[PDB]
Amino acid sequence: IEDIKGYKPHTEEKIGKVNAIKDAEVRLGLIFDALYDEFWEALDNCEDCEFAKNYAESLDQLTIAKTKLKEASMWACRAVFQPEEKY
Amino acid sequence: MIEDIKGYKPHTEEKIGKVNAIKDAEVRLGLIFDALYDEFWEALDNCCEFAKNYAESLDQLTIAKTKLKEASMWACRAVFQPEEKY
Amino acid sequence: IEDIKGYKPHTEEKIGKVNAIKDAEVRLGLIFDALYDEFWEALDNCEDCEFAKNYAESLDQLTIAKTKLKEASMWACRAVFQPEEKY
Amino acid sequence: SMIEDIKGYKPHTEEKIGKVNAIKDAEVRLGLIFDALYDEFWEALDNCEDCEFAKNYAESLDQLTIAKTKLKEASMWACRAVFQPEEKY
Amino acid sequence: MIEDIKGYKPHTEEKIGKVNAIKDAEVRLGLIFDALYDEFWEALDNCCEFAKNYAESLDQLTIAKTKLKEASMWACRAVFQPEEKY
Amino acid sequence: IEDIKGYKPHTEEKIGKVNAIKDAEVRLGLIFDALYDEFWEALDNCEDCEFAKNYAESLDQLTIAKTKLKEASMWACRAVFQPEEKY
Ligand SMILES: Nc1nc2c(ncn2[C@@H]2O[C@@H]3COP(=O)(O)O[C@H]4[C@@H](O)[C@H](n5cnc6c(N)ncnc65)O[C@@H]4COP(=O)(O)O[C@H]3[C@H]2O)c(=O)[nH]1
Ligand SMILES: Nc1nc2c(ncn2[C@@H]2O[C@@H]3COP(=O)(O)O[C@H]4[C@@H](O)[C@H](n5cnc6c(N)ncnc65)O[C@@H]4COP(=O)(O)O[C@H]3[C@H]2O)c(=O)[nH]1
Ligand SMILES: Nc1nc2c(ncn2[C@@H]2O[C@@H]3COP(=O)(O)O[C@H]4[C@@H](O)[C@H](n5cnc6c(N)ncnc65)O[C@@H]4COP(=O)(O)O[C@H]3[C@H]2O)c(=O)[nH]1
Ligand SMILES: [Ca+2]
Ligand SMILES: [Ca+2]
Ligand SMILES: [Ca+2]
Ligand SMILES: [Ca+2]
C-alpha cells in the first residue's frame, strides 16, 4: 500500500467492512448481470421486431446501473479505508 | 383503470418479482451503508485527531447511498420498460 | 402499486405534479433527440470527412445529456411520490 | 467579451446560438418546476417542524436538489454538443 | 458575443485567467487518461489472455474522461457565475 | 492487498501510472480548493449582500466539481489496477 500515494495501512476492522461492502455489491451486480443476459438473448432473437428497441434500451440502462453500483461501492470503500484527502 | 402516469405501462408478475428482487438486494447494501454512517457519526459526536476524517467519510457515504439509489432506479426502469420518448 | 415494495398509493395531487415534471422532461428530451438526429444525418452525408469525429463526439455527448435528464426526472418524481426510504 | 480568450472555445453561429438557447429555454422551464416543488416542500417543512412528515419533506428537498444538479449537467452536455469546442482528449 | 447566449455574463480578466487555469490542469490529466487509453487499445489491437481486461479498462477510462470534463465544467461554471434561474 | 476481495498484486508499472494519475488529480483538486477558499471569504465578508447568493452557489458548484474529479481518478485508477470484475 505504501507505494500508492495517499494510501494508509489496512486494519482488520477495515478489511472486514470493505469486504462486507464488496460482497453485497457483487450480489446486486450479479442480479444486474443476469437481467442483462436475459435482455441480450431476447434482443438477439429478433433485431427487427417491435420490442427490439425496448430491449436495446434496457441493456443500456442496465449498463448504467452497473456503473452506478461500482461508483457506490468505491465511494463507500473509500469512506472506510479513510485515505488521505488532499482536497 | 387507465394509466395515470405519463409513459407507465402495466405491471406483470414477472416484472414485479424482478423489481422487488433488485430493491431487496439494494436495501441490503444500503443498510450496510447506513450502519457505517451511524458508526462514523457516533465517533464524530464523541470526538480529536480524526474528526476531519470522520466527516469526510460521512460525506462519502452520503454519496454512496445516492449512487446506490440511482443504480436501483436505472435497473428497475430497465425491467419495467416504460415508454421511452427519447 | 402495492405489489412494489416501498410504493405508496397514487393521489390526484401527486399524479398532477409527476405528470408535469415528466411533460417538461420529455420536451427537453425531444430537443436532445432532434439534435441527435441532426448529427446522425450529418454523419450519414459526411462519412469519412474531416468533421466525422466531431459529429460522433457530439452524438456521445447528447447521449450523456439524455441520461442526465432522465436521472433528473427520476429524482424529482421520487421527491413527489415520497416512497419509504429505508436508508 | 471575446470567446477567443477562453481555451478551446470556437466562434458562435446563428445556428448554434438558436439551438443552445432552445436547450436553455427548455432546461429553465423544467428547472422552475423543480424550484416550485422545492419551495412548496420548504414551506411545508417550515410549517411542520416537529411533525411526523418532517423527515419526508427534508428527504424530498434533498432529492430535488439532486434533480436540479442533474438537469444543469444535462443542459451543459447538450450545449457542449452544439457548441463543439476543441476536445483535446 | 456572450450576450447572445441566455444567462451568460461578461468576462473579466480574473475570470479568464482562472477558467484557463482550470482547463489547463484539466487537459494535463485528460492527456494522461488518453495516453493510457491508447496504450490499452494498441494492446488489444495487436492481441489473447487479457483481452476482456483490456476492453474493460477502455470502458472505465472513457468514464473517467467523462467525469473529468464534468468536473471542469462545474468548476468553470463556478468561476463564470452565469445567471442561475433555479 | 490479497486480503481485499478482488484485488490483484501491484506491479511497478501499475504503481507508476496510478501515482501519475493521482499527482495530476491533486494538482487540479488544489486549484478547486483555492477557488473554494476565495469564494468562502468573499461570502463571509457580507452574507446579506447582493452577490452572496452567487458566491454560495459557486461554493456548491466547486464541491460538485471536487466530487467529479475524485470519481474520474478512481475510475482511471481502477482501469490501471485491473481488479477482478465479477459483473
Ligand atoms: N487509505 C487507504 N485507502 C484505500 C486503500 N485502498 C483503496 N483505498 C481507497 O478506496 C478507494 C476505492 O477502492 P475500491 O476498492 O472500492 O476501488 C479501487 C479498486 O477497485 C482498484 N484498486 C485499488 N487497489 C487495487 C489493487 N491492488 N489491485 C487491484 N485493484 C485495485 O482501483 C479502485 C480505485 O482505487 P482508488 O485509489 O482510486 O480509490 C480507492 C482509494 O481511495 C488503502 O489501502 N488505504
Ligand atoms: N412500465 C412501468 N415503468 C415504471 C413503473 N413504475 C416505475 N417505473 C419506472 O421505473 C423508474 C424507476 O422506478 P424506481 O422505483 O426504481 O424509482 C421510483 C420510485 O422510487 C418512486 N416512485 C414511483 N412510483 C412511486 C410510487 N407509487 N410510490 C412511491 N414511490 C414511487 O419514484 C422513483 C422514480 O419514478 P420515475 O417514474 O421517475 O422512474 C421509474 C419509472 O420510469 C410502472 O408501473 N410501469
Ligand atoms: N466552441 C465553443 N464551445 C463553447 C462555447 N461556450 C461554451 N462552450 C462549451 O459548452 C460547455 C457548456 O456550456 P454551458 O453554457 O452549458 O455551461 C457554461 C455556463 O454555464 C458557464 N459559462 C460559460 N461561459 C460563460 C460566460 N461568458 N459567462 C457566464 N457563464 C459562462 O460556464 C459553463 C461552461 O463551462 P465549460 O466551458 O467548461 O463548458 C462549455 C464549453 O465546453 C463557445 O463559445 N465556443
Ligand atoms: Ca416554522
Ligand atoms: Ca416561518
Ligand atoms: Ca415555530
Ligand atoms: Ca476575487
Numbering used by the authors:
A (entry chain F), C (entry chain B), F (entry chain C): 2 to 88
B (entry chain D), E (entry chain E): 1 to 47, 50 to 88
D (entry chain A): 0 to 88
What does the paper say about this structure?
In bacteria, cyclic dinucleotide (CDN)-based anti-phage signalling systems (CBASS) have been discovered. Using a genetic screen, we found that the phage protein Vs.4 antagonized cGAS signalling by binding tightly to cGAMP (dissociation constant of approximately 30 nM) and sequestering it. Vs.4 binds to cGAMP with a high affinity, thus sequestering cGAMP from its effector CapV, thereby enabling T4 phage to infect bacteria that do not produce enough cGAMP.
To further investigate this interaction, we determined the crystal structure of Vs.4 bound to cGAMP at a resolution of 2.0 Å. This structure revealed that Vs.4 formed a hexameric complex that bound to three cGAMP molecules. Within the hexamer, each cGAMP binding site is composed of two Vs.4 monomers, which make extensive π–π interactions between the purine bases of cGAMP and Y8/F82 of Vs.4. Extensive hydrogen bonds and salt bridges were observed between cGAMP and Y8, H11, K23 and R79 of Vs.4. Isothermal calorimetry (ITC) experiments showed that purified Vs.4 protein bound to cGAMP with a Kd of approximately 30 nM. To validate the experimental structure and to test the hypothesis that Vs.4 could bind cGAMP and sequester it from the effector protein CapV, we used an in vitro CapV activity assay, which showed that recombinant Vs.4 inhibited cGAMP-mediated activation of CapV. Importantly, we found that Vs.4 mutants harbouring mutations to either the cGAMP binding interface (Y8 and F82) or the hexamerization interfaces (L29, A66, A73 and A77) failed to inhibit CapV. Of the Vs.4 mutations identified from our forward genetic screen, A77I (which sterically clashes with the hexamerization interface), T12I (which removes a stabilizing helix cap) and S74N (which interferes with interactions with cGAMP) mutations were found to disrupt the ability of Vs.4 to inhibit CapV. We also found that mutations to the hexamerization interfaces (L29, A66, A73 and A77) abrogated cGAMP binding.
